[PDB]
Amino acid sequence: DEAAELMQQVNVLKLTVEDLEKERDFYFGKLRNIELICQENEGENDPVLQRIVDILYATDEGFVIPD
Amino acid sequence: DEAAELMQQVNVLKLTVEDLEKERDFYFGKLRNIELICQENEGENDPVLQRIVDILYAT
């Protein structure tokens, strides 16, 4: 029964999607919290923060949904 | 046709898994890059890096 087999596969993939969404969003949230820390401490010429800002750049929201 | 409908749903959910997983991995890798920078600069007693370390390991 192909329909039954596919329904089981759908249920499993849905759980996987829910889990991955949470994981993605949790890591993204960490990146955003770190971006905030950098933005707050902006213009104090800390070279390590500059390193971190440069890493952060590609993870910016504007590359996912235009802002 | 339930089987055909479900098959399309599987295809979409596989693509969704792929997209979410790749995104998760990319964000993880970036966090790990930041982690290393923090580790390398530990014992400088930089309070901003302490803030960042605390975010990294928050649950």
UniProtKB/Swiss-Prot annotation, chain B:
Subunit record text: Homodimer. Heterodimer with MAPRE3. Interacts with DCTN1, DCTN2, TERF1 and dynein intermediate chain. Interaction with DIAPH1 and DIAPH2. Interacts (via C-terminal residues 206-211) with APC (via C-terminal residues 2674-2843); the interaction inhibits association with and bundling of F-actin. Interacts with CLASP2, DST, KIF2C and STIM1; probably required for their targeting to the growing microtubule plus ends. Interacts with MTUS2; interaction is direct and probably targets MTUS2 to microtubules.
Gene: MAPRE1
Family: Belongs to the MAPRE family.
Protein's organism: Homo sapiens
Stretch list, region Interaction with SKA1: 42-59
PTM info: Acetylation at Lys-30 by KAT2B/PCAF promotes dynamic kinetochore-microtubule interactions in early mitosis. Crotonylated by KAT5 during mitosis, promoting astral microtubule plasticity and dynamic connection between astral microtubules and the cortex during mitotic chromosome segregation, thereby ensuring accurate spindle positioning in mitosis. Decrotonylated by HDAC3.
Compartment list: Cytoplasm, Cytoskeleton; Cytoplasm, Cytoskeleton, Microtubule organizing center, Centrosome; Golgi apparatus; Cytoplasm, Cytoskeleton, Spindle
Chain intervals for the UniProt region annotation (Interaction with APC): 16-21
Modified residues (N6-acetyllysine): 30
Region annotated APC-binding, chain positions: 30-52
Residue span(s) of domain EB1 C-terminal: 1-59
Region described as Interaction with CDK5RAP2: spans on this chain: 1-59
Region (DCTN1-binding): 18-59
Domain notes for this protein: Composed of two functionally independent domains. The N-terminal domain forms a hydrophobic cleft involved in microtubule binding and the C-terminal is involved in the formation of mutually exclusive complexes with APC and DCTN1.
Expression by tissue: Ubiquitously expressed.
Protein name per UniProt: Microtubule-associated protein RP/EB family member 1
Function: Plus-end tracking protein (+TIP) that binds to the plus-end of microtubules and regulates the dynamics of the microtubule cytoskeleton. Recruits other +TIP proteins to microtubules by binding to a conserved Ser-X-Leu-Pro (SXLP) motif in their polypeptide chains. Promotes cytoplasmic microtubule nucleation and elongation. Involved in mitotic spindle positioning by stabilizing microtubules and promoting dynamic connection between astral microtubules and the cortex during mitotic chromosome segregation.
